[PDB]
Every structure is written in structure tokens, then in C-alpha cells.
């Protein structure tokens, strides 16, 4: 079977070889990067079913990010397969500061009374935790008594019991045993810190990514359509209008404004890590199912992210709850599933991609029986969408091995993908930007080909390209769609049912 | 607004002019037929939406039937529109004889004592009604004292009160006021008369009709699949394998054997008049709904017949129950509705066809809301059927004015019809026998055209034929299906959505 | 089986014996009414399944109507069964006047030019038709050129070609051959004649009926809720608040105002006779299905009326379209079906009731498979309605022979009836007005019993009353509902599943 | 908000205090159990929503298990709340032996070469791991070179690289970093070891548990119905016929024989840990959904087990995939969710139960929108089930706070539970064995009460018990079912809708 659900894999040091050493080996960071060895490891992730790589600009400077994108370009030629390039913005992060001295962390007991400083550009002590707030904002007046400062993925709770106006320090009570380490994520739920719609650092990072050549941006902590539209303006200004924007939903404001965000964006990334700290963790599954259905109804892309195979950072096999999570994301209707630390930082990046692909491929077989999405309820709002509905009908009526679309912009492929046909979708397109832009759409196999002329038989081309790719053999039935004839048709207007010779 | 539900109109004296006189005028029967004046009246019925004319061989002789068929052929040339020719057999039936002195009928009052003769080959008198029993059977020993003899659709009941062994006559009491006319149907409920497999008169009548040129045979009182297969053998032997056979279901044996009868036949006529006497009258609506559903599921034609606008035989307006019946037959899923005495024997044959057409056109607009048929439940058993399902999906997804099929045998048109699309179906075919054979399929407008060559654009031909027929105009959306290309396609394999230029 | 669909039979001379003579016999009107013989004929209609008699105040003076109601009171004691008494108002009728001389009618040809007079209290001539307009209203200024004056059930069309202001006469063209007889119904569609909300004659007739003792009023030509509320005021003023009002829907205004009429009334009579003249005849089946569903959703009673077995006025067997009409009314969800001329004026009143009962009883067996009503969609708006829903669930889960309700006002019986359970409903009530008021509710068998005390076992009473009535036998399962205990319960609160001993 | 989904919590050292020391503290294992301090920790889990405790007889000896059962009996008296006692058998399993010198465990690195002994009845060393094979079987000839030996839920893999015939040891390579501890589960995928029908140790363990007093037995690695029936025979022989048997499904033979296993058992535990090693890991979510649906359809209990909040063994917050898994188990239809190492072996046993309860309570609120189970599809196979269907209907029709059943054996409560009403279910029963036996049914709150006499009002008792339990207050609506009257009713036969006074 072809894997219909797409995989986003985050890259990092786990796949990178430095002077013969693997990540974690003593002296690793002493060696220089082995680009070709690193590219060969990335190529195995491609072959195992990674469809797009995520460059997390939360970690690593422009030089590191640029070298990693260059490494991926080599890997595509080794694998003989192209992938999408996705930039993930830092966004409005709050992190613990470095500590006074060599100290990298301190342990605390429940009940201990300590201080959180708001003043920026200072080091932490054990009794006074300093915060690196994005844009060096002053958060003192945005956090009330009774709020919670959560350190390192919500593991250590600090309850704000008092506010000292004279030092702009929070007087906090430690709510549970735990460690405060340097440069760890901080969340302060149910506060409104006036972060800008687009920080200068995120503007800078996006402009650098656009210069290197990306297909997607995932915007961290989208609160409103304005956060999306500010990035859209840079993409249009720089001649990168083809770049697709995924809004990351990871706080209550993003959930409250979801309809206007979906309208502004090309898709949604369900950023469950921050979402499950910022809102009640037991509500994340409710929001996941609702976001998937709304994004599919819009004909846009949804990525389900974070902790999907978390145990595989350290172990070669996932837990039963991780297998269940990946399976259920697919059944809920996700276009794509994602790996973060599992592929970037863990001991088992290749096994993480392989395991996710195996689960994804099994789950796609149960979408007829258990699938939550319901294409029968959609309004068919254009003639290309009417043709997409008819293709889904044909794949419901008989056994169709493949749907082929000859698509200039990918619009027909995206509408067929929206209807989730019981078939793979081969999208024959005529430029690499359209090809890479389809790589996160459910079921879509993008394939670059010459633009057909007025005199070409597009149905013979479709069958020949499908046979070349090894997607079909003698006796298989396929559905082909195209705008016939070239130079007269203004849209996909034709559906052919064809038996492969 | 085109009428999708087809009308079968029975012809008889009501539309016939004889020496300038109309049916009912003094001296009418002393005149000979005025062929042109009659053909002009028949052309009005064709223009009002009669799709097929029924020639009932229970009435008249071969000469009357042959002349009436020739009058309809002139009527088609006057109207500029072809119709289907349907022959209705006598079958294993009992009919009243001709009367001595060519009286046509007598009137009777409740309580009169008269006789019914069993001797074959004699004429009736007012006091002694003679029976024409198929196969010239003697039924004297088959009918006990206390049986009811019903004349003419059960309009007049005779109770057997004694049997006269000297004359083999039933002594009967007239149960209700009414008429006994020549060649009227006689039922004797709850008797078992051993009618032959195929009466010699039926063999003669079928061969005469096939020689004249017919498109359909409705077989009266079909008991088993063998009754259909006996007629099929005659059609195949004489080179008339294109003739379609409608089995009339009008007794318990036909109901019991319905599945095998549907399998052998091209369609079913729900002959409610006899059915409602031979089985309990309150079961006829149950059987009607169930037959319509099974025949549609088999991709065949169903005709609903008898008493549909019965009151319009004598009055210019139908009753509320007649309008309800026609409307409900359409909602139940009928391909065709039929007029018997209304068109053959009544004062308002034109108004009856017009009235039926008006109701049928209103009811087809409620099929989406109320329609009993459910095409979502069908198994798509072939690639042509897969395309028919996709066409229905396209007409459900957007406003489609017309479906056009280029069909050599009518197969694609019959499968599109089976799915009851929200559109009229223009069937372009290449021979007059295929054209007339589609005239009773729901929604199908048959039209004769030249077979396309391999240099022709079939989509341009489809649009041009539709415009020229006045079915569509600039800006209408149509679906076109065809087997592309001519000389290579096995079957219909292409669907195009086209805006009329 | 018990018949669940109720029958309304119109009474008239057909069942009345006068000095040994049957209606239609020479000298019939010369004889005096034989009350007891007439009561014995009415008792047979009761035994055959008439549940309510209709007294049509369109025909016959107070003396005739009062004597007929008295005759029905004798018939109930002969049959051993009570019936409902329904008064049908004359309403805003327009009728042709008597003719100059002995003349009872004239024939006309299409094209003939004649006059319709608006002046009241004058006789007709052949060339000048005079109208008896209800309340002697002047209709001249309410009828435009191009309107149609329709005589005798829409059979003769008169087109208004000109208006003569000097005689206030309509200049009309005869549109079809036909007869204008004295005292025939006239309709003038798409005109607004300012008839009062309640005419003095209708006020008078209702007050007379209320004095005699009626259970129901059917209000002719209801246009608005005001027409209902004016009759409600008389019922409340006279101490007859228990009388239920059925609005007759028979024109476009009534259809347009249906929701407010349903809210004001206790039920709707679908008066298809006038409705199919006043609105396009082909729309009556659309309005019938929609009215039935809306009235059932309101928990109120719907009667389907007019022409249901029309042929049985003259023939002992109905047409196939009449059988179909009755069957389909039941499947559409009607509470009751009605007879007018078939039972009032025809040759076969008893056979008409019997035939309607047979069809109704067969159709009730198909409501699980084909029934249009959908109780799963209702909001359960009270605790008694929650219990009604649970009773329907129990009758869906297992074979329940009977539902018994101990009901003071009939409210619980009406809510159970609304849900159309697969069981008969025995309604045990404690006064005759409540008993007779339930006689047109689907499935309800009203039965008068002593009000239970605090110490009675109501479940034993229910089983004993069901066994006495012959509705159940040993081993049958029943559902019983009641407000337990008496004097504490404020509503039906208890459901028992019980096996009969 | 009551928790409807039941929690099974496994007990082990995590909640046990030994000489004032907590699990993990230095010297813990050199101290003896502090029974009162331990019982106080267990009482906190009961108060947090543990409904049943699991005693895993794969760990420890009879004395440890017996003392732990006695500590839980004290914990119930501290909490003032009863729980279920569940014994989990060893079954046809392989476990690691005890180590020489009572080391508990050793840590290993990838690439280490060690041995696995097959000789039975010996202890492990760090370099030579010994196996406890059920039935003391010799597995040396059953395991080929190239097989994988997996330790502890597949956390640590050993590859067989050679076999040493002199010692009957496997020579293995450590595949990944991890721990080998005593009494850990060992899997050897794709081998066929002839485990006996019922191991002597399982016979001993079941008899010991039955002597101590248990309510449930979970049978490990159920292969066929005979594995359940062998245990049933022991329960029936010792007078413990009230003990309920949960078959653990954790291999292909159990899946293949699921229908006959469900028929013999009282429920199913979906033992995902072993299932995901013994069958392909990506099939476990398919089997989980299908088991839940079949067990509910049989009116039995299903427990979803293993890795549900696995990360809370070491961290105070679950991963996003763990929360998704718990949430989806509830939506799939599980009666119960289970904690293994989280409660038995982890740093946060209380927080793990609290976390599970929070997710289970949120997910039960989405069963109307997302729930997989469909009670509309069940055949109601008895009159008690008919009443359970009616109760569900009442909770769907209006807001019902609580369903109260007076149940002698729990049968009515089990059938109401099967239908998953939108309400909590208070089951008033009359003996402690019936009370504890209902503790794993979805939504059921069991409560012990005096058997009502024939003079008692059961509806008043139901309301009083509900108020006294704090489940309802004045103005809440409840449904009450019972068999009325006591001493005559066969079964539950009455439903009352009651407003709490
Ligand atoms: O797709 P199906 O049901 O196998 O039918 C295929 C057959 O139909 C045909 O296409 C005829 O269809 P048309 O008569 O509609 O052109 C044959 O040529 C062919 O053998
Ligand atoms: O209605 P069913 O399924 O036949 O069950 C009837 C049985 O249930 C019982 O009523 C027990 O029910 P409870 O344990 O809920 O009281 C038995 O007394 C009786 O034999
Ligand atoms: Mg985030
Ligand atoms: Mg017939
Ligand atoms: Mg009327
Ligand atoms: Mg196990």
C-alpha cells in the first residue's frame, strides 16, 4: 500500500554525523558536520515515509538551519524523492535564564518559597528565577496573584502567592518536587502578554527561510487572523506567494478565533504540547477532533503534532498509548502526523518514521468503517469540487487503484484530497513549487511532468506516468481527471475510467 | 420543464372520427374510419405527452388493430414526434362474447335473473351471456354455486345461484346496476381453470403485431417465467429480438413468481384492474410499491396501470383520489403511468393525457423530498453502472439541466435512468428501433443521430443536438457521457461537465 | 386486528328509511322518517368501523340535523359502541340560484357568451346566472376580468371577459360543454371576498349544534386563526370548552396561515374538494403530506377528506386509484379518513365504511416499513411526553398487544397517539365527554370506567378492562401507564410491562 | 459530576510504606511493611476514583499478595468506600527468574553479549538470565537462532545469535539500553511453546485468592473457551460461583477464538502490552475497537489496559498521546480503564488515578457526540432488557440526574449499564458480593441496602438512598425501576419518573 497520511519529521542532531561520531557520543560537538553521511541518514527517513522536514527556529542559529536545509537537498537526490521544507517560527516563547556560576539546574521541594524576576538580561539564582521573555517584554503587570508559572513542559508548578512592586518579582510557592534547568520552556496560562502580531526575530527568521527556499511556514502561537496575515504580507512582498501558512493553535485565544484563522491560513498545525499546558489537558482531544473536521471542511491541511511516539526518543518500540494516538489521529481525519524530538533529538529517528508510517498505513484501511470525516455533508461550491465529488463516488462504486489528476496549480488535487477517496491520488503537475506544495495533502503523490500540448492524449500520459512510478499494473482500474482540451478548458472538466493495459 | 415520467395511452374509438362523426354521436358506428381526421386527433395526444400507444388485442380484430397502427404512423408525421408501439395480449383470460345482431351492450338492474353460457364459439344475447375462454376451455365444472362472476374490471357482479346441466349454463342474479358489453374482461375469483401455456390466439396476435412493427409486448396474466420465455422465443424466431417484453402482473401466481418473471422480462406492467379482483384489493398498494422497487433495482421499466384518472372518462376533472394516485405512483418510483378507458373509451382523451402530464411533472419535483427509490443502496455491477452513479452524483452536487449520452444500444441511457438523476436524459442513438425502445424509460428523451466517426468531437455533437432540440440554451450546465474514442472504447468511459456556448 | 386509523362518516338520506322506502325509491320523500329502522342502519356503520359521524350543515335545516343526531344516539345503543358527533359549518359558500320557471338546469357549449349577475335574491335565466352568495354579499368589485367562475365541483368553467358596471354583471365565455344546475357549488379562485370571520348563519348553526350535544366542529374555509378563535369564544361562553375545533383548509389563505391555524385549532381537516379547485389540483398531494406531518408534530388530529371512495356512491367496489388514495393517506400519517357522499347520499353506505376500514387496517401494518411520520425527530417537551416516548420504545423493542392509559382528560392518550406506537391504545377515562373527545385520535380505544381510588390497583384494573373488552388474552404482553398513586401523582409517572394471566 | 468509566488500579510497592520509608528511598527493602501507613495511602486512591484493585500474581509470593489484600480491606474502612478485588493470573507465560543474592535488577547497554538459560528452577545472574516457563517446560529446541527475546513489555530486546548445546543457553546480543528485573514478562515472538491447559501454579494462585476473598479473576493469555471454563470449574467447586472471570486477550489464538471466549467469560481485559508484541502492534487499535463493541453487545464488561498514562510512572504530567489514548478508550465504549506500573511501580500513584479520573469524566461528556457504541442496533432479548431500553429512551428525552434500580442479583443494573444511559446508575442491592461484583460496570454506583418487604414503598426507598448518598437533591428528576410488588414480580417491570422532594 502507499501511505496516504503524510509525515512531518523534525530534523536535528539525531541524524547528523560529526567526524564519524553519532549524537550522544563523547566529543560529538567537537567534530565538524559530515554533510554527506548526514544526508545519507536523512535519505533513509525519506525512503521510510517522511514527506516534509520541519526546521524548528526555536533551536539553532541561521547558519545551522541553512546548513541543515542544504543537507536535505542532497538527501532528496540520494532517495530519488522530493520532500517539503517547513519552517517553524520561535514565536512568543518564555524560557528560564542561564544560572549564576557553572550551575545548570537546581532541585526544589513542594512548599519551598522562591522568587521569579521579570527584569530582562539577568542570570537566575536558586532563590530568584529570571525569565528570557521573547522581545525582552516586561510581563510584571500581566500576571495576577493566583496564576501559575509552569516550567519544562508543565512539570514544575510555581504558584504566585504575592507580587513585590519594588523589585517586580513574583513571590511563588513550589507546588511539587522538581528541577528548574537553564533554557527550559515556561508557560503562564490564562495571562494576556501583549506580544506583537509578528516579532522582529520571527520576521528575520521567516525572511532567512524564504531566501533559502521553503514551501511551508508553521506560525507558533497564532492568536488571530492578524498573526497569519502579517506573515502572508512578507511572503507576497518577497515573491514567495506560493508558500503555504499553517497556523499553530496552542492557546485559548487561537481556539476562540479558529474560524477566522482557518479562513486566513492554508492549514492548521494542532500544537498539542503547548495546547495541553495552556488549556485543560483533558480538553485537547475534544479540540483535536473539532479542528480536524473544520479544516477538512475548508479543503485545507491539518497536521496533528507532539508526543505521538514520545517513548521512541529513548526506546526502539512505542507504547500502546502512542500507537493508539497515531491511529486515532488518522481515523479523526488528519492529513498529516508529525514527529518532533523523536526524529530531531532521539536515539531512534529512522525507527520513529518507520513505526509512524506502519501505523498510518494500517489506519487508512479502517477509514471506510470508522473514519470521522463525512464528505456527504459538504456543499460542492465549484465545478472542480463537483468533479472531486464524482471521483469519490467512482472510488466508492468499484475498486479504483489510483486517481490521476493533471493539475497546473494543484487545485484539483486538493479538492480530490478533501473528499478522501478510497484510492491514492497521483497529481501530475508542471513545476517543482506546485509539486512540493502538495506534499502534506492527504493521499497526494505529486509527480513533475512536461505540460501537455493541444495534441497530447492526457489519458495515455496519465496511464504511462502511473506505470513508470510503479503505482499500477495490467488490469488495474484508474480514474483520470483533466481539463480537456488544453487551451480551451478553463478547469478540470473530464473524468475517464480506464483499465491499465 | 420536461416530463420525466412516461405516459402509455390506450387507443380506441374515443380519438377516432368516422364519416365526420365523433365517438358518442348518433350513426357513428354506421360510418367508416376517417384516417386523416383520426391521425390529427392522435397527434394532439403525442404533443400532450403520450410517449407510447397501447393496442389492446382483447378488443376488435386484426384488421381494426392494423388500421389503428397505420393511423398512429400518420399521427407521428403530423406531430413530427415518434412514439412507442405496445401490443397488449389477451392471455389466459375470459372475455364476454359478441352479441347476436351486433348489439354492443345491454344494461341490467339489481335482482335480474339471467344466464351465463359455457359453450364456446357462440354469441351472447341479453338474457344469456356467452364467454370466450382462452384455449376454448369448458369451465362449467370449475364454477360452483355461490361463486361470483365479475364483468368489466368488477363493475358488474353476477352471483351463481344454480347450474342448469341441460344447457351447461350458470343461473345468476345481477348483484348491482350496470352494463355488460362485448369483449369485456370476466373474473371468477377463487376458481382454478387450466388455461394453456400459450393460447393459439395469442400466438396469432403476437405474430400479426410483429409483422406490423411494434416495440413492446405487454403479456397479460403472466403466471411464470415460461409465459415470458414463450413470447421471447417468437420474437427471436421472427428476427424481432429488439422487442421488449413487459410481464403484466395481475394474479397471485404472477406475484408468487415475481422474481423469476422480472429476470425473464424487460419490465413489469402493474395491471391493477385484474390484480385487485384476483388478490385482495387492499394488498394492491403493497404489491405496487414492492414491484416498483424491485424492477428499478433490476434496471428495468415499470408501468403503473388502470383507473389512474378513471373519472375523466365521463367528466372534465379528475377526483382528488385520482390525482393522489398518479402523484403517489410517481413518488413510489414508476417509470410510466398508463391511461386505459380515459384515452380509449372516454369523452376527454386529450384532457386526460394533459392532466396526467401536469400531475407527473409536479410530482417529479418532489422526488428529492419524498421519493421512495434509494439508488445509494445499489451494487454498481459494471463500469457503465459506475459511470451512471457518477452522473447521478454530479446532478446531486450542482444544477445540471440535461445529461447527454451517446448510446449505440441504449444500455448507458437505461443505467442513467435507473439512478433517477435530477435532470432530463438526452439519449443520442443511431437507429430507430433503439430510439423507440427507450421511450418508456424514466427521464429519457431519445433522439436519432448519425453514428460519430473517429474524427468527430462527440461533446460538440452532444451540445449541438441538445440546443437544436430546444432542451438547453447558452449558460446551462450539462453532463455528457460517451465511449471515447469511437473505434477503441469498449463502453461509456468518459464524463464531461460542459457550459453550453 | 383493531383499526387504528379513525373513520369520519357523513350522514344523510342514504341510511334513512321513510315509510318502508330506501333513498332513491319513488315516493321516498312522501313518507315520514322511520327513526328505529334508520338507527339500525346507522348501527351497522358503527359496527363496520365508523368512529365519528359528520353532520353537514351545508344541507338540511335544524329540524333535520337535530332528528339525525337523535337517530345516532339510538344507533350507539344498538351497536353497543359510542361515536363522536362532528358538526361541519356551511361557511362562505357561493351557489347557483333557482331558475325562472320549472327549469332545473340548462346545457351550454364552449364559446357561448353569457352573464353572471351579482345582485342577490333574484332567479337565474339561461343567459343570466344569478348567485346565492353567503350573507347576500355583493362580490362585483372583488372579481377582475380574466378570473374564472367554476360551477359544480369545477366541472363548468366561465371565463370573465368583461364587467358591465351598469347591471353589475360579469360577461363570461363558457370554456367547456357542461350543465349549470340550480343550487350547485361555485368557486372563483384567486379572489378575496370580504366574508366575515364568523357569519351570523354559522354562529346560529354552531349554537344549535352545541345545544344538541356535539364533540367536534369542522370550520369550513378557515383563512386565519381569527376564524378559529371566533368559534372557540362561543364554545367557552356556552360551557362547551370540551368541544374540539378542526380548521378546514380549503384555499390558499388557509395554506399560507397554516402554522397559526394549527396553533389555534385542535386539528385540521384537509378539505381536498374545495382545495383542489381553489389551488392547482396537482399541488393537493404536496399540501396533504406537509399538513399531516405538521399536525402530528403539534400532537393534534388530522382528517383526510373528500373523494376517497367516490366511485362507491354508485358501484359496490372502489377503483384502484381510490384504494391507493386511502392506503397512502394512512402511510402519510393521517389520524382519520373520511366519507362524504359515499356514506351520506350513495347506494352503498355500509359497503363504503367496510371497504375503508379494510384498507385502513391493511395500511396500518405497513407503517413500520413505509410510514412517513418520524417520532425520533420530536422534542419531548413535558414529562408526560417523555413517558409517551418510552411507551413507543417498549412497543419497538418487543411485541406489545396493547398500551393502556388511565387518563382523566385524555392528555396521556393524545401524547401516546402522537408517537404512533406499534400497538392499540386503550384509554380508560372517567367521563363521557373525554371518552367521545378521543374518538378521532389515531389508535385510541376510549373506554369509560369508574375513577380509581387511593386503594385500587390500577394495573389490575387495566388488565381486567382489557380482558373484558376482548382486546387481549392469556400470555399477551401489555404496557400500562398511570399517575401513581391517585391523590399524590400530578401526571402520568409510571410504566408497567405486564403479561395477561 | 460522577465518573461513569471505572478505574482498575494495580497495587504494588509504590503505595507501600516500609519502616516510615517511601518506595525509592535508601534502605526501603530492608524494612518491613507499615500496614496502617500503607492503608492510608491506598484509601487516597479509593477516594480519587479507583473502583477495583488488581493483585498481579506474576509478582511476589502468596504471603505478599495476602498481606496486600488485608491492607486494602483496612483501606476501605479508612475511606468508608468498598472496592472490587481482582486477581490477575500468571497463565501460559515466561517470566525472568529471581536473581542470585536478591539483586532485583541489572542495567545493560546495546551490544553487550549475555546468555539466557532454559534450565528450570534456577536463579539468574547478570550474565545468565534464567526463565520461569509456565509448566516448567524446556524451550531450548523451540527457539531458533535469529529469534528476538523481549523483556518487560518489549522494553529490552535480546537477539539470539548462537545456541550453546553444552548448557542449553541462548547466546544473545543486547539490542538497546535497558533493565532486566526479576519476575518480568518475556515474549519470544513467532515461537510455539506447548504450555499446559492450566498450570499447577495457576491452580494454586486461584485457590489462594478465592480463600482470601476476591470478586474478579483476570485470566492471562486466554487461548480458548476451555481456559475460562477450567477456572470457572474451580470457582463453582469451592462455592465461589459469584466470582466473575475476565479473559485477558493478548495473543493471536485469543483473538481467533474471541467469540467463544466472550460467551464463556463475564468480560474481557484488552491486555495491550502482550497483545502488541504477540500480534502486529499496528493491529492493536483495530482489535481494541472491535472487542469493546462485541463485549458491550453481549452485555458484559470490557477493561482497556496497559501504558494508558505510562509517562506518569516517572513524571507528574502525562503526554498528549496518553491523554488521547484514555479519552479514545472511553469514546470507543470501554467500561473501565486500567493503571499498571503507574499505580504499582511509579512516583505518582495518586496523581495517576486523579489524572485518569479527570480524563474519563471529560470524555463521558462527549459520548453523545462521538461515542462509537450504538444501542439502537441491539435486539432487546428479554423483558428486563426492554425496560433497560426504555430507561435509555427516558434519559435521551429529558435531563435525568440518576437512574435507580432495586436489583437482587445486579441483572437489571448490568442491562441498564449495557445501554449507556445519559445518567449515573444507582444499583441498590441486598448483599455485599452482588455490590462488589457491579464495581466495574460502566456508570454503576452499587450500594448495599435492606431487602424491601411487601409493605415498603420502593420508590421512596430509592429516593431516600439517592439523597443520603448525595447523588441528587430537591428538584432533580430521577428514573426508578423495580420489580413491583415484592413477592409477586418475576423481574423488573416498573419505571417511574420522580422529582426529588
Ligand atoms: O459496462 P457494461 O455494463 O459491462 O456494458 C458494456 C457494454 O455496453 C456497451 O458499451 C453498449 O453501451 P451503449 O449501448 O450505451 O453504447 C457495449 O459496447 C459493451 O459491451
Ligand atoms: O427479564 P430477564 O432477562 O428474563 O430476567 C429475569 C430474571 O431477572 C431477575 O429479575 C433478577 O433481576 P435483578 O437481579 O435485577 O433483580 C430474576 O428474578 C428473573 O428470573
Ligand atoms: Mg509549541
Ligand atoms: Mg388485466
Ligand atoms: Mg369544502
Ligand atoms: Mg499480559
PDB file of N, CA and C and ligand atoms in Angstrom, chain B residues 381-385 405-413 415 430 434 489-492, ligand 1:
ATOM      1  N   UNK B 381     -22.731  -2.838 -10.630  1.00  0.00           N
ATOM      2  CA  UNK B 381     -22.335  -4.196 -11.068  1.00  0.00           C
ATOM      3  C   UNK B 381     -21.526  -4.170 -12.364  1.00  0.00           C
ATOM      4  N   UNK B 382     -21.189  -3.006 -12.921  1.00  0.00           N
ATOM      5  CA  UNK B 382     -20.397  -2.898 -14.164  1.00  0.00           C
ATOM      6  C   UNK B 382     -19.805  -1.502 -14.230  1.00  0.00           C
ATOM      7  N   UNK B 383     -18.832  -1.303 -15.105  1.00  0.00           N
ATOM      8  CA  UNK B 383     -18.191   0.031 -15.271  1.00  0.00           C
ATOM      9  C   UNK B 383     -19.192   1.016 -15.872  1.00  0.00           C
ATOM     10  N   UNK B 384     -20.133   0.595 -16.729  1.00  0.00           N
ATOM     11  CA  UNK B 384     -21.142   1.555 -17.226  1.00  0.00           C
ATOM     12  C   UNK B 384     -21.995   2.029 -16.055  1.00  0.00           C
ATOM     13  N   UNK B 385     -22.349   1.127 -15.133  1.00  0.00           N
ATOM     14  CA  UNK B 385     -23.167   1.483 -13.972  1.00  0.00           C
ATOM     15  C   UNK B 385     -22.386   2.419 -13.073  1.00  0.00           C
ATOM     16  N   UNK B 405     -26.218  11.267 -23.294  1.00  0.00           N
ATOM     17  CA  UNK B 405     -25.455  10.017 -23.505  1.00  0.00           C
ATOM     18  C   UNK B 405     -25.444   9.677 -24.990  1.00  0.00           C
ATOM     19  N   UNK B 406     -24.278   9.380 -25.544  1.00  0.00           N
ATOM     20  CA  UNK B 406     -24.179   8.788 -26.908  1.00  0.00           C
ATOM     21  C   UNK B 406     -24.178   7.283 -26.761  1.00  0.00           C
ATOM     22  N   UNK B 407     -25.269   6.652 -27.177  1.00  0.00           N
ATOM     23  CA  UNK B 407     -25.591   5.254 -26.793  1.00  0.00           C
ATOM     24  C   UNK B 407     -25.940   4.476 -28.073  1.00  0.00           C
ATOM     25  N   UNK B 408     -25.208   3.420 -28.375  1.00  0.00           N
ATOM     26  CA  UNK B 408     -25.454   2.534 -29.543  1.00  0.00           C
ATOM     27  C   UNK B 408     -26.685   1.645 -29.295  1.00  0.00           C
ATOM     28  N   UNK B 409     -26.826   1.083 -28.114  1.00  0.00           N
ATOM     29  CA  UNK B 409     -27.902   0.090 -27.820  1.00  0.00           C
ATOM     30  C   UNK B 409     -28.907   0.642 -26.813  1.00  0.00           C
ATOM     31  N   UNK B 410     -28.608   1.776 -26.184  1.00  0.00           N
ATOM     32  CA  UNK B 410     -29.426   2.349 -25.109  1.00  0.00           C
ATOM     33  C   UNK B 410     -28.987   1.904 -23.718  1.00  0.00           C
ATOM     34  N   UNK B 411     -28.009   1.033 -23.584  1.00  0.00           N
ATOM     35  CA  UNK B 411     -27.567   0.462 -22.292  1.00  0.00           C
ATOM     36  C   UNK B 411     -27.202   1.603 -21.329  1.00  0.00           C
ATOM     37  N   UNK B 412     -26.354   2.548 -21.757  1.00  0.00           N
ATOM     38  CA  UNK B 412     -25.918   3.639 -20.870  1.00  0.00           C
ATOM     39  C   UNK B 412     -27.128   4.478 -20.450  1.00  0.00           C
ATOM     40  N   UNK B 413     -28.054   4.768 -21.373  1.00  0.00           N
ATOM     41  CA  UNK B 413     -29.266   5.540 -21.038  1.00  0.00           C
ATOM     42  C   UNK B 413     -30.126   4.789 -19.998  1.00  0.00           C
ATOM     43  N   UNK B 415     -29.123   2.570 -17.736  1.00  0.00           N
ATOM     44  CA  UNK B 415     -28.426   2.674 -16.397  1.00  0.00           C
ATOM     45  C   UNK B 415     -28.495   4.091 -15.803  1.00  0.00           C
ATOM     46  N   UNK B 430     -28.447   5.709 -32.815  1.00  0.00           N
ATOM     47  CA  UNK B 430     -28.082   5.683 -34.251  1.00  0.00           C
ATOM     48  C   UNK B 430     -29.032   4.806 -35.072  1.00  0.00           C
ATOM     49  N   UNK B 434     -33.699   1.282 -31.647  1.00  0.00           N
ATOM     50  CA  UNK B 434     -33.131   1.630 -30.314  1.00  0.00           C
ATOM     51  C   UNK B 434     -33.844   2.871 -29.779  1.00  0.00           C
ATOM     52  N   UNK B 489     -12.948   2.601 -27.513  1.00  0.00           N
ATOM     53  CA  UNK B 489     -13.688   2.386 -26.243  1.00  0.00           C
ATOM     54  C   UNK B 489     -14.567   1.127 -26.343  1.00  0.00           C
ATOM     55  N   UNK B 490     -14.558   0.307 -25.294  1.00  0.00           N
ATOM     56  CA  UNK B 490     -15.443  -0.876 -25.032  1.00  0.00           C
ATOM     57  C   UNK B 490     -16.842  -0.359 -24.687  1.00  0.00           C
ATOM     58  N   UNK B 491     -16.879   0.748 -23.957  1.00  0.00           N
ATOM     59  CA  UNK B 491     -18.105   1.173 -23.248  1.00  0.00           C
ATOM     60  C   UNK B 491     -18.024   2.653 -22.973  1.00  0.00           C
ATOM     61  N   UNK B 492     -19.135   3.236 -22.517  1.00  0.00           N
ATOM     62  CA  UNK B 492     -19.107   4.589 -21.947  1.00  0.00           C
ATOM     63  C   UNK B 492     -18.010   4.637 -20.881  1.00  0.00           C
TER      64      UNK B 492
HETATM   65  O1  LIG E   1     -20.161  -1.681 -18.771  1.00  0.00           O
HETATM   66  P1  LIG E   1     -21.081  -2.896 -19.008  1.00  0.00           P
HETATM   67  O2  LIG E   1     -22.374  -2.947 -18.185  1.00  0.00           O
HETATM   68  O3  LIG E   1     -20.166  -4.103 -18.983  1.00  0.00           O
HETATM   69  O4  LIG E   1     -21.526  -2.729 -20.573  1.00  0.00           O
HETATM   70  C1  LIG E   1     -20.556  -2.767 -21.602  1.00  0.00           C
HETATM   71  C2  LIG E   1     -21.305  -2.910 -22.928  1.00  0.00           C
HETATM   72  O5  LIG E   1     -22.119  -1.752 -23.157  1.00  0.00           O
HETATM   73  C3  LIG E   1     -21.849  -1.211 -24.416  1.00  0.00           C
HETATM   74  O6  LIG E   1     -20.922  -0.154 -24.175  1.00  0.00           O
HETATM   75  C4  LIG E   1     -23.056  -0.568 -25.044  1.00  0.00           C
HETATM   76  O7  LIG E   1     -23.397   0.691 -24.420  1.00  0.00           O
HETATM   77  P2  LIG E   1     -24.234   1.711 -25.212  1.00  0.00           P
HETATM   78  O8  LIG E   1     -25.323   0.935 -25.909  1.00  0.00           O
HETATM   79  O9  LIG E   1     -24.790   2.616 -24.136  1.00  0.00           O
HETATM   80  O10 LIG E   1     -23.270   2.370 -26.106  1.00  0.00           O
HETATM   81  C5  LIG E   1     -21.228  -2.373 -25.226  1.00  0.00           C
HETATM   82  O11 LIG E   1     -20.424  -1.879 -26.288  1.00  0.00           O
HETATM   83  C6  LIG E   1     -20.405  -3.037 -24.165  1.00  0.00           C
HETATM   84  O12 LIG E   1     -20.120  -4.411 -24.380  1.00  0.00           O
END
